[PDB]
Amino acid sequence: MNVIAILNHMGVYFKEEPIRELHRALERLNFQIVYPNDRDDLLKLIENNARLCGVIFDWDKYNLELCEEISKMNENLPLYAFANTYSTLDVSLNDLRLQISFFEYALGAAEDIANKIKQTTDEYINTILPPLTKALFKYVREGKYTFCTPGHMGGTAFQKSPVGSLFYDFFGPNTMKSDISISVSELGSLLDHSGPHKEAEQYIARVFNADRSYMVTNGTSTANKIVGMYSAPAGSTILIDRNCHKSLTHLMMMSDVTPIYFRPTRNAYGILGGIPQSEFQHATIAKRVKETPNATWPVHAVITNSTYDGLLYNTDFIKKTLDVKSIHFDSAWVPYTNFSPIYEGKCGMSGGRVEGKVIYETQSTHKLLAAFSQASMIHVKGDVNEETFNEAYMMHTTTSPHYGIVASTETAAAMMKGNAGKRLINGSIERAIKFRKEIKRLRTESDGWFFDVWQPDHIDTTECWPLRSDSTWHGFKNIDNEHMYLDPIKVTLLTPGMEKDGTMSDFGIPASIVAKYLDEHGIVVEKTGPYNLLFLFSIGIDKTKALSLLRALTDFKRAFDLNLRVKNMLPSLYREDPEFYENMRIQELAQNIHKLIVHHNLPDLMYRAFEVLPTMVMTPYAAFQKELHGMTEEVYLDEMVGRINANMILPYPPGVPLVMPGEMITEESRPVLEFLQMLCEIGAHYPGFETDIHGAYRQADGRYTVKVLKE
Amino acid sequence: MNVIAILNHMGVYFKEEPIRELHRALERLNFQIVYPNDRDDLLKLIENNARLCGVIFDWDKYNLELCEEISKMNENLPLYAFANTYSTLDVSLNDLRLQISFFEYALGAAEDIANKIKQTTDEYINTILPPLTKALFKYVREGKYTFCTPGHMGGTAFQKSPVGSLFYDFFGPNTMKSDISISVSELGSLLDHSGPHKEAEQYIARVFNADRSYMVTNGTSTANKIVGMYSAPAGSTILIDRNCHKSLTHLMMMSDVTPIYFRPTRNAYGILGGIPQSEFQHATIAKRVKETPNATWPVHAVITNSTYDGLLYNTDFIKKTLDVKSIHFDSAWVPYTNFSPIYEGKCGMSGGRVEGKVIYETQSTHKLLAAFSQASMIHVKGDVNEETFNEAYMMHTTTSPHYGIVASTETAAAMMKGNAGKRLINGSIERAIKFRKEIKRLRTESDGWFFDVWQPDHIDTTECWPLRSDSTWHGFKNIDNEHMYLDPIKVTLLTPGMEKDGTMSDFGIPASIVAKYLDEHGIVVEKTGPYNLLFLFSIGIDKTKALSLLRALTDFKRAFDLNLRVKNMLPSLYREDPEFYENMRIQELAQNIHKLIVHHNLPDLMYRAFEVLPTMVMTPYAAFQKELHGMTEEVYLDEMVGRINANMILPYPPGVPLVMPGEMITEESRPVLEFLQMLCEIGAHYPGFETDIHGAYRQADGRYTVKVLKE
Amino acid sequence: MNVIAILNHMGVYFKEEPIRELHRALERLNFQIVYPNDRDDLLKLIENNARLCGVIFDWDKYNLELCEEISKMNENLPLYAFANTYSTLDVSLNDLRLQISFFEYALGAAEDIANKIKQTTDEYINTILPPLTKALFKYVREGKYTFCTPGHMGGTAFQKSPVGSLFYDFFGPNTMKSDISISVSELGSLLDHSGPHKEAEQYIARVFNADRSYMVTNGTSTANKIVGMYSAPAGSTIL
Ligand SMILES: Nc1nc2c(ncn2[C@@H]2O[C@H](COP(=O)(O)OP(=O)(O)O)[C@@H](OP(=O)(O)OP(=O)(O)O)[C@H]2O)c(=O)[nH]1
Ligand SMILES: Nc1nc2c(ncn2[C@@H]2O[C@H](COP(=O)(O)OP(=O)(O)O)[C@@H](OP(=O)(O)OP(=O)(O)O)[C@H]2O)c(=O)[nH]1
């Protein structure tokens, strides 16, 4: 934070010379001094440089051209306004939030003015920093405790060791010194929710629209379990999204509960859709309780909102309709929903309290905001028993939390506060929409096939576009209306190969091939299905990254159409098996994999495998207890009908749980087995395109086994 | 790592001028040159500066004076040896580990030699760095993945925000870029135990004497639960140290198990002693199983080794005697035991496999080695079902681990490896012993009272000194021999106030007053009891911190004997309650508090409180289930006899569990209540010396309540 | 390969100052920075100077005027394109072979951008160098074999002799160190057609429109005899 802008040629030495003097005085204080040419140049400087922390200008010349524009960008940004005898305040300024200091033009005043600017810069810094992080930085600057844990004592133990010195030097002093413990009494305590930690939690709850917020330092994996353990006593029944993260399987394995699954929909691409509205109705649930051994009325429900591919629920509908006293939205993918009105009514915290219910979001701050790995938040709307909730929190929280992770969780909130926060989120939405429109444009303009974007036929509006039953784009048959919405920032691209019907085209380019090409060019694909690719247009992704991705896609098409050798176009793939890929061309690879997909009927098998559930013979908890007693064995995948599965089976595609521990494939659920067998067969053909089923094990002879409970 | 030492005046220009040329060439490559005066000056430079990464010298003049001494300090340290025509290799060098390059004295060769030195320095760095940390640092320098989580994208996202830029600037680019995910495929995966992660685990197991080691990123709080949950299925019985960390109480609250408690001893100071040898013998356990409802033969045993105050067990005895197939040493306080022979036979991993048993250590690498907060290791000796063990591991491990914490765990191993590592731990043992001897010396030399050290009458040997039944220093009655040992690095200081009999002295200085004094001077007291203070002489604590502590203790005596005003001697205490402390002097404070301890009979009540056990009415798991159903209420502490406790009650002193959830104080265990009532009374008198009982709540009228289950 | 061209007057400090900063950061990495007046000046600079290895320019201002013309001269030439908020890719670029990195105008970003340019320059060099030559140059920079023929050992033996030192100094270190033998096993072998030598032969064959190519080190005088002796056994007739 050291860049000061000076805006001006004034034509009078009595103004210009004191400004030259101020330039020199500011440089002596280690500011860097920048000179925009005009009003628009200055606004671009502010917009492009977060470290620009002050603006010097002639008041009469510029106030009516600058003040309103600046206030929209940054409420808090120091203005250093130089006054004329008759300078005054226009009524248009009355309601603007501005930080203004007024100065005179005088020779010899520069040193004093520079000192005031320095002081006002520190006040700005202290205004924008949140409380715990501010306290942590101050401690690192000023503090001096010894005989403390961490045993490394601000990195001291590292410096006495050759390898330790490399480690210390890599991370640097501030990182090492900020790794502290509750011995630093002035920072309070995470587990006690005291001092600056209490201030951080209250600060976060305000920013994120929660009644109460908890900082978790072991990821949403852990936040999910804290919420679940508080919410679901032994002997109870819970409703759980079949599209649930593995941490919720772990919760079920650790807690003696009976699950009843919400059943999401899916399209022909293998993309998950929303749990239909009928799944939330009392009659539906009551009947499933009746049909489930040992089930009672659910005390807790867990819903994944949004889906991975960006489908958000009408959460107003869910909260009004779902007659369960505790509703937890696993919101790991959507930590930013409070920061744009486009997400209103589409996130757990939206709106107010619900009578007789507590609502939660868990969020992975590190995924789609800016925070260190393992940073997570629990947001609560409604009443909890605070002591009992804290026991559950403490059961999963270390006694030695990492303060960097904690500070980063609080600073993520600070970043999202106000106009600078709204602008960060708006910008990610705008850039996602810009890129979405570019794909559609290039699809029209290019010669022959192109990528498509999975979205409405027109996106002339900035909103989470509703999925409507009268539109074919989303692929979900007979969808509920006013139920699901597409998050603009979750951009799904489609490769040729499937028709509007959900039927197969003659020409196809399996998305795995495009992903391989992108990885050559350092672009990671978050998620891939047979003909789909997901890109997260997060606040991380700037215009430069968006352009690089767009250019890589036009280059894929250009190179594909030239039919380059695999050896040249996909060197990393070639290196996996040069002899196999020596003479193969890209169009041949695409054709062959596509024909495999078609021949094996993969999309239809994948649809049918997930449309029926395996039978719950025992709960995940009960199955794991069996495993703990050594009562598992391996059988060939082919032999698993009528056996109780020990491990979750999670195939890619489509990357969601297929079989839970304690479930059995029966005749009712035979397509589960056939899908798994097909994945094993199709994966045996192309090096680099191997079968990937978590819970299935390739044997030396190329058959797969799975782990089942002993009879 | 950029300091190169040149050792010499040779008296011939043909040698001196090329070395002048090399000095310049090396400065151009950004090395610092240093010029020791002689052999001993060079060795001190190496001893004091881990970043000294090369030594240049005339081979004939120095090799017989340097090579052996250097090899004893650093096996790997590059030597750049300048040879004469007749230079040869002495037979004494044959078995030394040395890294030597031979060079000639020639004008114009310096640029080439300097380039070879640069290359050799990089090889040295690559030799000493462990595999995962090396890969991480290399990725940071060279990698270029975009469209990646963490969403901050090497800190990118922070730089677009004013407050974010401050956070980025504080931690720095390396810290930000090293926060990565499994998208960086060349680093493999923690959860899959693959690539450099697998290399890290094997490297660690080798360094720490384990068959298998796991890196945990949520502290030993979590490592304890991973081991416990693998080891103790629902319905089972476990043997658990009554001196158990809260994480083990949480384990019992989360797992449907029945505890039987090992019963530690204690002394009149309130310092915990070891579980007696009789507690481990078959007939003792069999009888307890018979007397405990629902108990069966224990499948798993948990022992805290060492105690907080440094008492280590004869673990050879435990392993031979304890007829339980799974024995877990919670070794959070002693992660360094594999690095000095003084700990052989006194730690979990010591020795070889135990037939028919699996042995664990869990260790908080961040407490007494050098690693980031939350870094923990599980060490296994014996067979586990690797796949079931991994499920329990994954159940408590995030899907987005913090790679800094992971790299710090592996680097802690790299630091402890070999001669560098033996020297580090030897150093800390030597310093602890030096300081112990200094207290004994000052006690003799000083005028009137002084501190004492809780240790044997003679410590003229470097070992973990055995506690003997024929010695009275440790205060334990009828102790088993060849059973408990005192770790040199855990230094307990005693303040005046108790006689050798365990009776009270007329003159006392409660240790709490000394702790408040030390805290004024930025010295943290790890643990305090009525008349004891614990200091950890970790590899953090250098000679400078040891002298600062010794001086602070002499200053405490000096200022105490002058009888300074509390206002002047303890200003932070004074500003607690200025009006209360306005005229009080230090000796009066010490006297008054000591008289209170004496009047209330605190040591006798504390001893008796912990010698009986509350009655286990239900297991902690069953008690927590009741709390989860809302079935708790608050009663006054005075009315708790015959009530089932909902919370753990943990009083300070002596800082170990007194009552577990599910336990009830009866007439048989009334001393528990008497002790707690006394702590409440004694704590009402002096601001800053308040009652501290976890599980008891001070009401506005000064009465205390506890949480119990509803009748 | 160390000349970088910057093309421009933009009229806004928010763009010009970051480019000034980038100038300085690049000179610190030992690049030389040239400033063409306009599009045609830049194209002449590229045409006349093979060691011009990168071009920095404002994307919007120049992409439609530069990208096709550059792709006609050099497929592989690094372009460092500075983007505006609304910068996009014209359909006319689709089939051009371009190497483009996109950057933002920001104060204090120059050190990072200059390092990325350095990296891209090394990637460009490694793209255009063929496999054996690239391996040879890397060995000279990095290798350390001893007890090696040629007996001169990277020119070492020459430096011990007054006349030898003159010979070494004339040809220079790279020439002397690149005179190696099959002892440098990572370069494979000409006679075995192995390793980078096999890659060189296949590279050559493709460039020259051959099924197979052989590298001969004793002139076409010798290449003629190799072909001839394989082709014409004793007692045969040749045209
Ligand atoms: N403190 C302060 N606030 C002002 C001022 N002028 C406008 N505001 C706005 O008012 C908010 C404080 O509103 P209050 O009514 O005082 O607080 P409350 O909403 O928590 O009850 C600030 O929100 P915020 O918490 O700063 O964050 P955000 O909502 O702007 O992101 C800020 O947006 C001012 O002069 N001082
Ligand atoms: N690589 C290598 N090792 C040598 C050499 N000379 C002695 N050593 C020592 O030998 C150890 C390796 O012993 P091995 O028999 O190869 O491996 P093992 O102990 O794992 O079976 C090294 O231990 P370490 O794992 O490096 O650590 P530490 O035991 O010294 O702490 C090091 O102490 C050598 O020339 N090269």
UniProtKB/Swiss-Prot annotation, chains A, B:
It holds the Pfam family OKR_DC_1. This is Inducible lysine decarboxylase. Inhibited by ppGpp, also known as the alarmone. It is found in: Cytoplasm. Induction: Part of the cadB-cadA operon, which is under the control of the Pcad promoter. Expression is regulated by CadC. Induction occurs under conditions of low pH with excess lysine and anaerobiosis. The global regulator Lrp also has a positive effect on the expression of the cadBA operon when cells are exposed to moderate acidic stress in the presence of lysine. Repressed by H-NS under non-inducing conditions. One of its GO terms (molecular function) is lysine decarboxylase activity. It catalyses: L-lysine + H(+) = cadaverine + CO2. The lineage of its organism: Bacteria, Pseudomonadati, Pseudomonadota, Gammaproteobacteria, Enterobacterales. CDD domains: Orn_deC_like. Belongs to the Orn/Lys/Arg decarboxylase class-I family. It comes from the Bacteria. Keywords: Cytoplasm, Decarboxylase, Lyase, Pyridoxal phosphate. Its main location: cytoplasm. Homodecamer; built of five dimers associated in a 5-fold symmetrical double-ring. Interacts (via C-terminus) with RavA. It comes from Escherichia coli (strain K12). GO terms for biological process: lysine catabolic process. Its EC number is 4.1.1.18. Inducible lysine decarboxylase that catalyzes the proton-dependent decarboxylation of L-lysine to produce the polyamine cadaverine and carbon dioxide. Plays a role in pH homeostasis by consuming protons and neutralizing the acidic by-products of carbohydrate fermentation. The modification N6-(pyridoxal phosphate)lysine is found at K367.
